[PDB]
């Protein structure tokens, strides 16, 4: 039953249970299973920093650019939650560096919001749009300024 297997894959991926994930996949669970709002196992592993699980999901055909009903991508979550190694692997596997969520935020905005210097540097190197504006017209730069992180602002200009 696909719904049962999908729910367990979602949970094991979120929990970082590397072994259970492989078992469930060997048993038919779909790497592209979605919950009610459109979250996938890759969203949750990315959000929670489960690096090995991120890699195995991708190797098994997970959509690196899946978006939930609010336009949230695995790259958005990895960037906000400050998971550098996951950000690099996602980008390497084709993640859209300039995806916009419901609020008009790109991964660069989200990196700026939680003040991740290393992640901002990586996104920029990968063609992040420094001029992108969110729903209220603000760039990643604007955000770091409003938050007083002017060291981040300086590389975001």
């Amino acid at each position: 039953f696909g719904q049962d297997l999908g729910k367990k894959l979602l949970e094991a991926a979120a929990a970082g249970q590397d072994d259970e994930v492989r078992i469930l996949m060997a048993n038919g669970a779909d790497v592209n299973a979605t919950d009610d709002n459109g979250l996938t196992p890759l969203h949750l592993a990315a959000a929670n920093g489960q690096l090995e699980i991120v890699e195995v999901l991708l190797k098994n055909g997970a959509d690196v650019n899946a978006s939930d009903s609010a336009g949230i991508t695995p790259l958005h979550l990895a960037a906000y939650d400050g998971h550098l190694e996951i950000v690099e692997v996602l980008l390497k596997h084709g993640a859209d560096v300039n995806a916009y969520d419901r609020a008009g935020w790109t991964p660069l905005h989200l990196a700026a919001l939680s003040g991740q210097l290393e992640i901002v540097e990586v996104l920029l190197k990968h063609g992040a749009d420094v001029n992108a504006q969110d729903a209220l017209g603000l760039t990643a730069f604007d955000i770091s300024i409003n938050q007083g992180q002017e060291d981040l602002a300086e590389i975001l200009q």
Binding site: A14, N37, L39, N48, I72, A135
Partner: protein, 138 residues
């Protein structure tokens, strides 16, 4: 890393913990390895009314457990969130509809869409038990 994401003061937090007693606890679980479990026990032990929310259980720590916040019949003042950052932000709107005064994001649960949807007061990257210990403890 337990640095608050919100800009609230100690007095704001003190008011929240003392003014409000009715807490919907989202992601409540019987598992000892879920912090939702140890926190819910601590809140019950310190005079709070806790209504567990988790569609995967009918009961948690001896209290009826509801599938969503709206399903709780009781008045709800605070919504205390123990779910993934991909998920937790969606409860602001649910809290607004319920008439809750406060939405409290525990460690590693906040995502900035919570701000846009935002009463209600947003507490972010703090723990209810740890704040209570710090401000109201013996």
């Amino acid at each position: 890393a337990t640095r608050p994401i919100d800009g609230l003061t100690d007095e704001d937090i003190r008011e929240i913990l003392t003014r409000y007693k009715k807490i919907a606890l989202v992601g409540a679980s019987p598992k000892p390895e879920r912090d939702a479990n140890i926190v819910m026990k601590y809140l019950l032990e310190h005079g709070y009314d806790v209504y567990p929310v988790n569609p995967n259980y009918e009961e948690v720590l001896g209290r009826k457990c509801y599938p969503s916040v709206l399903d709780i019949p009781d008045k709800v003042e605070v919504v205390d969130l123990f779910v993934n950052p991909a998920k937790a932000w969606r409860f602001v709107v649910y809290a607004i509809k319920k008439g809750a005064k406060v939405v409290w994001f525990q460690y590693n649960t906040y995502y900035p869409l919570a701000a846009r949807q935002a009463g209600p007061i947003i507490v972010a990257n703090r723990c209810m038990m740890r704040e209570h210990e710090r401000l109201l403890g013996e």
